[PDB]
């Protein structure tokens, strides 16, 4: 079950407040799997986090 963290730091806070407002992480889940990517142009390297 995927959930996007908005686009800017104005709606992401509301998205969170929704996520812990309607018990998205109830006592049934197993993992949260927070994942994102990063880019460094100075060395030209990507990084999967």
């Amino acid at each position: 079950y995927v959930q996007e963290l908005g686009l800017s730091l104005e709606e992401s806070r509301d998205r969170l407040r929704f996520l812990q407002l309607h018990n998205w992480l109830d006592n049934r889940s197993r993992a949260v799997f927070l994942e994102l990517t990063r880019y460094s142009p100075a060395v030209g390297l990507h990084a999967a986090v």
Binding site: Y39, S40, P41, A42, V43
Partner: protein, 480 residues
């Protein structure tokens, strides 16, 4: 004639031991220890728990600068006199602060790298890694004084540093602080208000020095903070206790006389070596006791040359003593002192190895030397293979675990780690949490192969030749 050379070698040993006795003075480790504890261990703030050794962000650097740094630099004025104007600071009521500390930075240029055209919309700014060809040489921000204007290396009288990530030049954007805390703090606050450390800064240096008139021994302190292109902060430091006013006491005159005697000894040794080589034994190199002689002579000549070079070039102290409200540039002296210390250390190490030529007096000591000389060739032959396998393991570890373990981040670090594994000085943790497969396999195979096979092979090689030599000598003695 096994006696003319023995006596003049014991005299050389005595002179060398006297030379290093005064070179490595006592109550000097405590001085550097106190300075290091004062500067690298005091927390940046009362409510903070980080110090200079564990800086983690550019915001922590600003907390350290206007903070634990000014506390250790500008100590109290111990008010018991008139205190006419801006009294000087004694760091431990004994350590005088010479001149005034200097801060400087090295940064790069905005148009340095070349981001790809595919995503040239969401990426607007980029700064390449530090290099001379990619350095900023233009005024930035409030182009008012010397902290916002580039000033070439020749104008700072500086030189390279060879830090951790790269080799930084001697130029950059610098600023000389004030002699009192209430003004240095104001200058640092003014620097911080309008941003001085942007995202394009690559390095920052802070330099000063102290005297400690009790025991005549200067001390130069340098602190470097490196900002890599990938983010983060890397701190480094050095505290060099150098001496510049040698001839004050009789013991220094004794040391000078000993140095003169050492120079005469080196001259005699080189003259006798060249006299031997000029007419006798034009090949001369198949003994292993003549390469050592030329190595010792070359190292001693280099040490004497370095000492003369760094003793004649002490005009910086004379310049500083004229105007004492200026930054004293004492970095070249510390660098040359370090080089001279290294050369002296290796020379002293090699002389004691040369000592081996004379311990052959009794029969029970002849067989050991004979065994060593007979087994050296085979030991080298097997050491070639040992080193080849060791380097293969090191390169495999570097390529596999070299990006996550922090113990294999460099080929040299891999070599040191593999030597430490033999000591049983390994934790077995970061290897296995780095990779559950090929992690323990590498460790197990390395330990098994290396220890068992190669250590036992070395033992067999030495034991067989020792037994052979002993049996040969016993048979020869019993048959004669």
């Amino acid at each position: 004639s096994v006696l003319r050379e023995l006596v003049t070698y014991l005299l050389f040993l005595i002179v060398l031991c006297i030379l290093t006795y005064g070179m490595m003075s006592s109550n000097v480790y405590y001085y550097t220890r106190m300075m290091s504890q004062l500067f690298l261990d005091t927390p940046v703030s009362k409510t903070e728990k980080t110090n200079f050794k564990t800086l983690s962000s550019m915001e922590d650097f600003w907390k350290f600068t206007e903070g634990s740094l000014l506390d250790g630099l500008y100590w109290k004025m111990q008010p018991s006199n008139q205190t006419e104007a801006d009294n000087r600071s004694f760091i431990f009521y004994e350590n005088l602060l010479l001149g005034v500390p200097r801060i400087r930075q090295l940064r790069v240029r905005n148009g340095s790298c070349s981001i790809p055209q595919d995503l040239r919309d969401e990426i607007k700014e980029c700064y390449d890694v530090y290099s001379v060809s990619s350095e900023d040489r233009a005024p930035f921000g409030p182009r008012n004084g010397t902290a916002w204007i580039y000033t070439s290396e020749k104008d700072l009288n500086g030189s390279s540093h060879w830090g951790i990530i790269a080799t930084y030049s001697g130029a950059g954007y610098y600023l000389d602080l004030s002699r009192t805390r209430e003004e240095t703090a104001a200058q640092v606050a003014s620097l911080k208000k309008n941003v001085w450390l942007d995202r394009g800064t690559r390095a920052t240096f802070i330099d000063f020095s102290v005297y400690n008139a009790n025991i005549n021994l200067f001390c130069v302190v340098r602190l470097l903070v490196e900002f890599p292109a990938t983010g983060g902060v890397i701190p480094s430091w050095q505290f060099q206790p150098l001496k510049l006013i040698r001839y004050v006491t009789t013991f220094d005159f004794f040391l000078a006389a000993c140095e003169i005697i050492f120079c005469f000894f080196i001259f005699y040794y080189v003259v006798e070596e060249i006299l031997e080589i000029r007419i006798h034994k034009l090949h001369y190199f198949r003994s292993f006791w003549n390469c050592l002689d030329v190595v010792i002579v070359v190292l001693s000549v280099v040490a004497i040359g370095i000492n003369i070079y760094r003793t004649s070039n002490v005009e910086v102290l004379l310049q500083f003593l004229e105007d004492q409200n200026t930054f004293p540039n004492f970095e070249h002296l510390a660098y040359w002192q370090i080089q001279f210390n290294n050369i002296a250390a290796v020379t002293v190490f090699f002389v004691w190895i040369k000592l081996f030529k004379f311990i052959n007096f009794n029969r029970t000591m002849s067989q050991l030397s004979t065994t060593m000389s007979r087994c050296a060739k085979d030991l080298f032959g097997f050491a070639i293979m040992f080193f080849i396998i060791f380097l293969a393991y090191a390169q495999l570890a570097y390529l596999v675990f070299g990006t996550q373990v922090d113990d294999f981040s460099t080929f040299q670090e891999c070599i040191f780690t593999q030597f430490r594994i033999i000591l049983g000085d390994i934790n077995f943790a970061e290897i296995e949490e780095a990779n559950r497969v090929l992690g323990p396999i590498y460790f197990t195979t390395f330990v098994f192969f290396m220890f068992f096979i190669l250590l036992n092979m070395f033992l067999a090689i030495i034991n067989d030749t020792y037994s052979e030599v002993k049996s040969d000598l016993a048979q020869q003695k019993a048959e004669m």
